[PDB]
């Protein structure tokens with residue numbers, strides 16, 4: 123009865139410990155979600171195996187095939203018991219899997235190279251010298267596509283039409299584009315990742331502005347799972363013990379480089 | 381099949397409309413939670429009657445008698461079908477009722493009279509000229525009592541034995557105390573209330589510093605309620621439509637007096 127935990131290699135949530143690539147078991151991994159998994163398992167009393175999601179995806183339903191990929195798919199199709207990862211709680215997902223209460227809050231935020239004269243989304247939408255974009259298939263893009271806020275609608279119209287593309291294939295590519303673009307590119311991404319990258323060498327990026335929206339990460343289990351209730355109370359307990367904030371501080375700031 | 385909704389009279393969540401003392405029905409009430417109930421009801425397809433919690437309490441279990449008071453009491457003792465109110469999601473409550481995903485995020489924050497030279501909790505912790513405190517019974521006090529964080533334990537050491545007492549019996553008392561103390565008292569309270577009060581005449585208080593913790597308000601239903609699932613999905617849907625942010629803006633800022 124070892125619980126299969128699906129997760130995704132994403133710093134600082136889940137990372138290969140230095141020189142552990144040829145070792146085995148859960149002990150290979152470190153990070154915020156590894157710490158959280160250990161605490162969840164301790165409090166619900168189960169043994170578990172951390173497994174990295176095969177396709178490296180979080181979880182979206184293919185428009186055409188209607189098949190769920192990523193961690194959500196591993197839960198929906200019965201290949202994992204629990205997903206402990208920075209998995210956003212969303213309507214479409216909650217329709218097919220169960221989420222705990224959020225263990226971390228976040229929102230959409232702007233990443234700039236230090237010195238870029240931009241302080242807000244409004245600032246970006248007013249000008250054209252600084253290009254801006256987001257992940258090509260992501261939550262951020264969808265936020266802008268659906269938004270009725272004038273400023274965000276203005277940004278969406280600029281982004282959808284800009285040429286060559288302002289969208290990027292991965293977060294790493296978004297960050298590289300900010301870093302290499304001499305202040306002429308800003309990247310819109312989850313605040314949690316923005317604040318992480320701000321603490322990494324070469325310390326040349328900054329988070330600016332308030333968050334544009336408000337969402338949370340949750341631990342996910344298959345519908346009807348007998349683990350769901352326990353995991354949920356465990357998340358609330360860990361929050362009340364200050365453990366979630368302690369873990370955030372540890373992996374973002376105590377281990378920070380700036 | 382009219383759903384009985386319990387709530388509590390707390391601005392700007394639920395308020396008596398001006399001069400409506402002698403009027404009847406749902407129409408007497410206005411506010412953020414009144415607007416939210418109307419959305420939840422519409423999206424889940426039910427008719428409802430708003431009632432104000434009998435005993436004016438949120439929901440605590442009497443340590444001795446183990447009886448639940450307030451809105452939690454009304455769900456668990458069968459007097460109301462759903463609570464839509466600024467009810468914090470906590471471990472002890474989630475053991476006896478179900479919570480929706482949070483519709484609003486919040487945390488402990490600092491309220492000062494404008495002009496007071498304090499910018500953060502750490503600032504407060506390093507001095508004694510400005511007294512500071514919290515509701516004498518409630519989440520905030522317990523947060524500080526429990527906290528292993530240096531600055532917070534230091535503040536708890538101070539408040540525990542402060543004289544005259546730094547604690548206040550109600551929230552209006554805490555606010556009044558800030559307002560009347562000529563800059564010599566700071567009040568620790570929910571960030572949502574802090575930012576509401578900041579927009580209310582006489583516009584003489586200020587919210588300072590980041591939040592000291594993170595919590596959420598959720599809609600509460602009894603275990604096994606036939607409403608739980610739909611309400612949870614409605615809350616996610618409203619957040620994604622941008623409606624929860626639109627509501628917060630409406631009741632805090634659009635109707636603000638400052």
Ligand SMILES: N[C@@H](C(=O)O)[C@H](O)[C@@]1(C(=O)O)CC[C@H](C[C@H](NC(=O)c2cc(Cl)c(O)c(Cl)c2)C(=O)O)N1
Pocket residue numbers: 178179180181182192208209210211212257259260261262264312
């Ligand atoms: N925490 C992640 C997530 O839970 O998917 C992020 O939201 C992330 C992103 O920023 O978009 C990280 C990469 C990943 C990409 C991709 N996700 C999406 O396509 C997506 C995600 C959400 Cl939450 C959504 O509402 C919509 Cl309309 C689409 C993934 O499946 O690998 N999703």
Ligand SMILES: N[C@@H](C(=O)O)[C@H](O)[C@@]1(C(=O)O)CC[C@H](C[C@H](NC(=O)c2cc(Cl)c(O)c(Cl)c2)C(=O)O)N1
Pocket residue numbers: 437438439440450466467468469470515517518519520522523570
């Ligand atoms: N939104 C309210 C809540 O849901 O009870 C507040 O948290 C509030 C407070 O700030 O304490 C407002 C009045 C009310 C008082 C009282 N509740 C408590 O005493 C309490 C509440 C929480 Cl969330 C908690 O973690 C602990 Cl350890 C104790 C009551 O329920 O009327 N609780």
Ligand SMILES: [Zn+2]
Pocket residue numbers: 139142149
């Ligand atoms: Zn090792």
Ligand SMILES: [Zn+2]
Pocket residue numbers: 161164165
């Ligand atoms: Zn523990």
Ligand SMILES: [Zn+2]
Pocket residue numbers: 419422423
């Ligand atoms: Zn609606």
